[PDB]
Amino acid sequence: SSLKEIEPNLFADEDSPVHGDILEFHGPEGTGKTEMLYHLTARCILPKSEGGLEVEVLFIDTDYHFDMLRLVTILEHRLSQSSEEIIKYCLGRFFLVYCSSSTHLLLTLYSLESMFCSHPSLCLLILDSLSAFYWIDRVNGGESVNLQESTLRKCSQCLEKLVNDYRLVLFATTQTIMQIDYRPYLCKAWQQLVKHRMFFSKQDDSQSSNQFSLVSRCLKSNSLKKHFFIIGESGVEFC
DNA sequence: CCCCCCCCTATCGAATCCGTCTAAAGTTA
Ligand SMILES: Nc1ncnc2c1ncn2[C@@H]1O[C@H](COP(=O)(O)OP(=O)(O)OP(=O)(O)O)[C@@H](O)[C@H]1O
Numbered sequence: 001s002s003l004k005e006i007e008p009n010l011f012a013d014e015d016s017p018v019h020g021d022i023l024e025f026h027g028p029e030g031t032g033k034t035e036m037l038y039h040l041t042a043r044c045i046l047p048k049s050e051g052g053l054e055v056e057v058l059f060i061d062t063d064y065h066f067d068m069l070r071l072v073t074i075l076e077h078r079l080s081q082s083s084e085e086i087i088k089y090c091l092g093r094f095f096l097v098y099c100s101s102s103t104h105l106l107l108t109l110y111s112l113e114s115m116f117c118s119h120p121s122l123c124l125l126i127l128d129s130l131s132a133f134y135w136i137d138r139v140n141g142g143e144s145v146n147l148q149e150s151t152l153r154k155c156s157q158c159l160e161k162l163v164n165d166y167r168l169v170l171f172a173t174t175q176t177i178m179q180i181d182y183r184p185y186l187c188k189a190w191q192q193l194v195k196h197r198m199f200f201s202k203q204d205d206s207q208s209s210n211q212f213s214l215v216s217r218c219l220k221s222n223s224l225k226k227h228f229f230i231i232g233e234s235g236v237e238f239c
Numbered sequence: 240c241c242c243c244c245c246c247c248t249a250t251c252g253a254a255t256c257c258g259t260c261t262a263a264a265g266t267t268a
Protein backbone atom coordinates (compact mmCIF):
# COMPACT_ATOMS: atom_id res chain seq x y z
CA SER A 1 0.00 0.00 0.00
CA SER A 2 2.62 2.51 -1.15
CA LEU A 3 1.71 5.93 -2.54
CA LYS A 4 4.26 5.69 -5.36
CA GLU A 5 2.23 3.05 -7.21
CA ILE A 6 -1.17 4.68 -6.56
CA GLU A 7 -0.39 7.81 -8.58
CA PRO A 8 3.25 8.76 -9.27
CA ASN A 9 2.08 11.64 -11.48
CA LEU A 10 -0.11 13.67 -9.11
CA PHE A 11 1.92 12.68 -6.03
CA ALA A 12 5.51 13.68 -6.79
CA ASP A 13 7.38 12.50 -3.66
CA GLU A 14 5.12 11.11 -0.93
CA ASP A 15 5.88 7.39 -1.24
CA SER A 16 5.44 5.24 1.89
CA PRO A 17 3.08 2.50 3.15
CA VAL A 18 0.16 4.70 4.16
CA HIS A 19 -1.34 4.48 7.64
CA GLY A 20 -4.11 6.76 6.37
CA ASP A 21 -4.52 9.67 3.95
CA ILE A 22 -7.33 12.14 3.26
CA LEU A 23 -7.69 13.71 -0.19
CA GLU A 24 -10.39 16.14 -1.31
CA PHE A 25 -11.41 17.55 -4.69
CA HIS A 26 -12.59 21.12 -5.27
CA GLY A 27 -13.86 22.52 -8.54
CA PRO A 28 -16.78 24.15 -10.33
CA GLU A 29 -19.42 22.36 -12.38
CA GLY A 30 -18.31 20.14 -15.25
CA THR A 31 -14.59 20.01 -14.52
CA GLY A 32 -13.91 16.28 -14.19
CA LYS A 33 -13.93 15.21 -10.54
CA THR A 34 -16.26 12.29 -11.25
CA GLU A 35 -14.19 11.28 -14.28
CA MET A 36 -11.01 11.32 -12.18
CA LEU A 37 -12.74 9.14 -9.58
CA TYR A 38 -13.82 6.78 -12.38
CA HIS A 39 -10.22 6.57 -13.61
CA LEU A 40 -8.99 5.81 -10.09
CA THR A 41 -11.62 3.08 -9.66
CA ALA A 42 -10.72 1.58 -13.05
CA ARG A 43 -7.02 1.52 -12.17
CA CYS A 44 -7.82 0.08 -8.72
CA ILE A 45 -10.43 -2.56 -9.64
CA LEU A 46 -9.00 -4.55 -12.57
CA PRO A 47 -7.04 -7.80 -12.12
CA LYS A 48 -3.31 -7.53 -11.47
CA SER A 49 -2.56 -8.95 -14.93
CA GLU A 50 -4.16 -5.94 -16.66
CA GLY A 51 -2.37 -3.32 -14.57
CA GLY A 52 -4.83 -3.73 -11.70
CA LEU A 53 -4.32 -3.99 -7.96
CA GLU A 54 -7.03 -6.44 -6.78
CA VAL A 55 -7.99 -4.49 -3.66
CA GLU A 56 -11.36 -3.47 -2.26
CA VAL A 57 -13.07 -0.12 -2.89
CA LEU A 58 -16.22 1.43 -1.45
CA PHE A 59 -18.21 4.26 -3.04
CA ILE A 60 -20.59 6.51 -1.12
CA ASP A 61 -23.11 8.17 -3.44
CA THR A 62 -24.57 11.48 -2.24
CA ASP A 63 -24.86 13.60 -5.40
CA TYR A 64 -26.85 10.75 -7.03
CA HIS A 65 -24.63 11.45 -10.05
CA PHE A 66 -22.92 8.05 -10.24
CA ASP A 67 -23.34 6.58 -13.73
CA MET A 68 -22.79 2.84 -14.20
CA LEU A 69 -23.01 2.78 -18.01
CA ARG A 70 -20.11 5.24 -18.15
CA LEU A 71 -18.11 3.14 -15.68
CA VAL A 72 -18.67 -0.10 -17.61
CA THR A 73 -17.79 1.64 -20.89
CA ILE A 74 -14.57 2.93 -19.31
CA LEU A 75 -13.63 -0.53 -18.01
CA GLU A 76 -14.41 -2.17 -21.36
CA HIS A 77 -12.38 0.39 -23.31
CA ARG A 78 -9.49 0.32 -20.81
CA LEU A 79 -8.48 -3.36 -20.80
CA SER A 80 -7.09 -5.44 -23.67
CA GLN A 81 -9.42 -8.44 -24.08
CA SER A 82 -13.09 -7.85 -23.25
CA SER A 83 -15.77 -10.35 -22.25
CA GLU A 84 -18.98 -10.48 -20.24
CA GLU A 85 -17.66 -12.99 -17.69
CA ILE A 86 -14.51 -11.04 -16.82
CA ILE A 87 -16.38 -7.75 -16.49
CA LYS A 88 -18.92 -9.41 -14.19
CA TYR A 89 -16.07 -10.90 -12.14
CA CYS A 90 -14.44 -7.47 -11.85
CA LEU A 91 -17.67 -5.68 -10.91
CA GLY A 92 -18.42 -8.28 -8.27
CA ARG A 93 -16.13 -6.20 -6.02
CA PHE A 94 -17.47 -2.65 -6.39
CA PHE A 95 -19.45 -1.28 -3.44
CA LEU A 96 -22.06 1.48 -3.58
CA VAL A 97 -23.99 3.15 -0.74
CA TYR A 98 -26.79 5.72 -0.90
CA CYS A 99 -27.56 8.55 1.53
CA SER A 100 -30.38 11.07 1.92
CA SER A 101 -29.55 13.32 4.91
CA SER A 102 -26.80 14.15 7.39
CA THR A 103 -28.40 12.00 10.09
CA HIS A 104 -28.90 9.16 7.60
CA LEU A 105 -25.29 9.67 6.50
CA LEU A 106 -24.08 9.28 10.09
CA LEU A 107 -26.28 6.21 10.56
CA THR A 108 -24.77 4.63 7.43
CA LEU A 109 -21.27 5.52 8.63
CA TYR A 110 -21.94 3.72 11.90
CA SER A 111 -23.67 0.76 10.23
CA LEU A 112 -20.86 0.11 7.73
CA GLU A 113 -18.50 -0.89 10.57
CA SER A 114 -19.87 -4.45 10.71
CA MET A 115 -18.98 -5.38 7.12
CA PHE A 116 -15.95 -3.10 7.42
CA CYS A 117 -14.36 -5.05 10.29
CA SER A 118 -15.54 -8.31 8.72
CA HIS A 119 -13.47 -7.33 5.65
CA PRO A 120 -9.78 -6.57 6.24
CA SER A 121 -9.52 -6.43 2.43
CA LEU A 122 -11.15 -2.97 2.38
CA CYS A 123 -8.38 -0.42 1.81
CA LEU A 124 -9.75 2.45 -0.33
CA LEU A 125 -12.81 4.59 0.38
CA ILE A 126 -14.59 7.17 -1.80
CA LEU A 127 -16.88 9.95 -0.57
CA ASP A 128 -18.47 12.54 -2.85
CA SER A 129 -20.20 15.84 -2.08
CA LEU A 130 -19.97 15.96 1.70
CA SER A 131 -21.09 19.60 1.35
CA ALA A 132 -24.35 18.70 -0.41
CA PHE A 133 -26.36 19.31 2.78
CA TYR A 134 -24.40 22.43 3.76
CA TRP A 135 -27.21 24.89 3.07
CA ILE A 136 -29.97 22.74 4.58
CA ASP A 137 -28.32 22.26 7.97
CA ARG A 138 -26.92 25.80 7.91
CA VAL A 139 -30.48 27.13 7.60
CA ASN A 140 -32.09 24.64 10.01
CA GLY A 141 -29.89 25.72 12.92
CA GLY A 142 -30.62 29.42 12.59
CA GLU A 143 -28.00 31.90 13.77
CA SER A 144 -26.61 29.47 16.36
CA VAL A 145 -23.28 28.35 14.88
CA ASN A 146 -23.03 25.39 17.27
CA LEU A 147 -26.54 24.26 16.33
CA GLN A 148 -25.48 24.02 12.70
CA GLU A 149 -22.50 21.94 11.59
CA SER A 150 -22.83 19.78 14.71
CA THR A 151 -23.89 16.60 12.91
CA LEU A 152 -21.24 17.33 10.27
CA ARG A 153 -18.64 17.58 13.04
CA LYS A 154 -19.80 14.25 14.47
CA CYS A 155 -19.59 12.67 11.01
CA SER A 156 -16.08 14.06 10.56
CA GLN A 157 -15.08 12.62 13.94
CA CYS A 158 -16.44 9.20 12.97
CA LEU A 159 -14.68 9.27 9.59
CA GLU A 160 -11.39 10.30 11.19
CA LYS A 161 -11.73 7.53 13.78
CA LEU A 162 -12.35 4.93 11.07
CA VAL A 163 -9.54 6.10 8.78
CA ASN A 164 -6.92 6.27 11.53
CA ASP A 165 -8.23 2.98 12.96
CA TYR A 166 -8.02 0.68 9.93
CA ARG A 167 -5.49 2.52 7.69
CA LEU A 168 -7.75 3.79 4.91
CA VAL A 169 -7.06 6.03 1.93
CA LEU A 170 -9.92 8.45 1.27
CA PHE A 171 -10.86 10.72 -1.62
CA ALA A 172 -13.47 13.44 -1.07
CA THR A 173 -15.45 15.73 -3.36
CA THR A 174 -16.44 19.30 -2.48
CA GLN A 175 -18.32 22.13 -4.20
CA THR A 176 -17.58 25.72 -5.21
CA ILE A 177 -20.33 28.09 -4.10
CA MET A 178 -19.08 31.44 -2.82
CA GLN A 179 -16.84 34.10 -4.39
CA ILE A 180 -5.75 29.14 -6.54
CA ASP A 181 -8.81 30.90 -5.13
CA TYR A 182 -10.41 29.13 -2.18
CA ARG A 183 -13.02 30.22 0.38
CA PRO A 184 -13.68 27.54 3.02
CA TYR A 185 -17.15 27.21 4.49
CA LEU A 186 -17.10 23.82 6.27
CA CYS A 187 -16.19 22.90 9.85
CA LYS A 188 -12.72 23.73 11.15
CA ALA A 189 -11.97 20.16 12.28
CA TRP A 190 -12.45 18.62 8.83
CA GLN A 191 -10.46 21.50 7.34
CA GLN A 192 -7.60 20.45 9.61
CA LEU A 193 -8.11 16.77 8.72
CA VAL A 194 -7.15 17.41 5.08
CA LYS A 195 -3.66 16.75 3.74
CA HIS A 196 -3.68 17.95 0.11
CA ARG A 197 -5.98 20.08 -2.03
CA MET A 198 -6.82 19.27 -5.65
CA PHE A 199 -8.01 22.53 -7.18
CA PHE A 200 -9.86 21.75 -10.41
CA SER A 201 -9.98 24.15 -13.36
CA LYS A 202 -11.30 23.96 -16.92
CA GLN A 203 -10.25 25.76 -20.11
CA ASP A 204 -12.94 27.37 -22.25
CA ASP A 205 -11.64 26.80 -25.78
CA SER A 206 -12.73 23.69 -27.67
CA GLN A 207 -9.10 22.84 -28.50
CA SER A 208 -8.49 22.47 -24.75
CA SER A 209 -12.00 21.09 -24.12
CA ASN A 210 -10.30 17.80 -23.18
CA GLN A 211 -7.30 19.37 -21.38
CA PHE A 212 -7.69 20.64 -17.81
CA SER A 213 -5.34 22.09 -15.21
CA LEU A 214 -4.79 20.79 -11.68
CA VAL A 215 -3.01 22.49 -8.77
CA SER A 216 -1.94 20.63 -5.63
CA ARG A 217 -0.33 21.86 -2.42
CA CYS A 218 1.24 20.00 0.50
CA LEU A 219 0.26 21.11 3.99
CA LYS A 220 3.75 20.44 5.41
CA SER A 221 5.67 21.99 2.48
CA ASN A 222 3.33 24.40 0.61
CA SER A 223 4.72 23.16 -2.71
CA LEU A 224 2.75 23.68 -5.92
CA LYS A 225 2.30 20.90 -8.48
CA LYS A 226 0.76 21.39 -11.93
CA HIS A 227 -0.71 18.64 -14.08
CA PHE A 228 -2.37 18.54 -17.50
CA PHE A 229 -4.53 15.62 -18.62
CA ILE A 230 -6.78 14.65 -21.52
CA ILE A 231 -10.18 13.02 -21.06
CA GLY A 232 -11.42 10.28 -23.36
CA GLU A 233 -14.13 7.73 -23.96
CA SER A 234 -11.70 5.05 -22.74
CA GLY A 235 -11.03 7.01 -19.54
CA VAL A 236 -8.46 9.58 -18.42
CA GLU A 237 -4.98 9.90 -19.93
CA PHE A 238 -2.18 12.28 -19.00
CA CYS A 239 0.27 14.43 -20.96
C1' DC B 240 -21.54 34.88 2.07
C1' DC B 241 -25.99 34.52 -1.52
C1' DC B 242 -28.78 37.03 -6.94
C1' DC B 243 -30.23 40.12 -10.91
C1' DC B 244 -30.52 45.67 -14.54
C1' DC B 245 -29.97 51.50 -18.72
C1' DC B 246 -30.03 54.72 -22.67
C1' DC B 247 -30.59 59.17 -28.51
C1' DT B 248 -28.66 63.60 -31.05
C1' DA B 249 -28.21 66.88 -34.67
C1' DT B 250 -28.79 70.17 -40.73
C1' DC B 251 -25.98 71.16 -45.01
C1' DG B 252 -25.10 72.97 -49.51
C1' DA B 253 -25.97 76.33 -55.70
C1' DA B 254 -25.54 75.38 -60.97
C1' DT B 255 -26.48 76.55 -66.15
C1' DC B 256 -27.36 80.46 -71.78
C1' DC B 257 -30.15 80.23 -76.41
C1' DG B 258 -31.96 81.73 -80.93
C1' DT B 259 -32.79 86.15 -86.60
C1' DC B 260 -36.51 88.65 -89.33
C1' DT B 261 -38.56 91.76 -92.64
C1' DA B 262 -38.56 95.74 -98.98
C1' DA B 263 -40.23 100.50 -100.48
C1' DA B 264 -40.78 104.41 -103.56
C1' DG B 265 -40.85 108.16 -110.07
C1' DT B 266 -38.88 112.54 -112.05
C1' DT B 267 -37.98 116.23 -115.12
C1' DA B 268 -38.76 119.27 -122.13
N1 LIG C 1 -16.88 10.03 -23.81
C1 LIG C 1 -16.35 11.21 -23.45
N2 LIG C 1 -15.29 11.67 -24.15
C2 LIG C 1 -14.76 12.85 -23.80
N3 LIG C 1 -15.13 13.68 -22.82
C3 LIG C 1 -16.18 13.19 -22.15
C4 LIG C 1 -16.84 12.00 -22.39
N4 LIG C 1 -17.88 11.82 -21.50
C5 LIG C 1 -17.83 12.90 -20.75
N5 LIG C 1 -16.83 13.77 -21.09
C6 LIG C 1 -16.52 15.05 -20.45
O1 LIG C 1 -16.34 14.83 -19.07
C7 LIG C 1 -16.49 16.12 -18.45
C8 LIG C 1 -16.70 15.95 -16.97
O2 LIG C 1 -18.09 15.63 -16.72
P1 LIG C 1 -18.61 15.33 -15.26
O3 LIG C 1 -20.07 15.54 -15.16
O4 LIG C 1 -18.13 13.93 -14.87
O5 LIG C 1 -17.80 16.37 -14.37
P2 LIG C 1 -17.55 16.62 -12.82
O6 LIG C 1 -16.82 17.96 -12.69
O7 LIG C 1 -16.89 15.47 -12.17
O8 LIG C 1 -19.03 16.84 -12.29
P3 LIG C 1 -19.91 17.95 -11.55
O9 LIG C 1 -20.14 19.03 -12.61
O10 LIG C 1 -21.25 17.25 -11.26
O11 LIG C 1 -19.22 18.45 -10.33
C9 LIG C 1 -17.64 16.78 -19.21
O12 LIG C 1 -17.44 18.19 -19.30
C10 LIG C 1 -17.61 16.11 -20.59
O13 LIG C 1 -17.27 17.04 -21.62
Ligand SMILES: [Mg+2]
Nearest residue numbers: 033034063065
Ligand atom coordinates in the same frame (compact mmCIF):
# COMPACT_ATOMS: atom_id res chain seq x y z
MG1 LIG D 1 -19.98 15.04 -10.83
